[PDB]
Amino acid sequence: ASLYVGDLEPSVSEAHLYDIFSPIGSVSSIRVCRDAITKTSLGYAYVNFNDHEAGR
């Protein structure tokens, strides 16, 4: 139903995680975390799923 994805580079966009995790299952959404001031990514992200099987 979701996933945390850590150990990422700030140049890794959401499309890299999409090319990894959409072969796993139905990606509902992806968001890469940034700082609210620097507009620089924080090295991790989140991929919301919808099913438990694709999450496992």
Partner 1 sequence: GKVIPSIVQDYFNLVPLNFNNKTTLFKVFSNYDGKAYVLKRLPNIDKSMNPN
Structure tokens that stand for 16 in this block: 């890299």
| 20 or 42: CB nearest partner 1 | 42
Among 37, 52, 53, 56, indicate the residue that binds partner 1 (CB under 8 A).
37
Number of residues near partner 1 (by CB under 8 A): 4
- Give pairs for 11-15: CB < 8 Å, separation 24+: 12/41, 12/45, 14/45
Among 4, 11, 15, 40, indicate the residue that binds partner 1 (CB under 8 A).
40
Neighbours of 27 (CB within 10 A): 19
Name the site residues for partner 1 (rule: CB under 8 A). Answer: 37-40
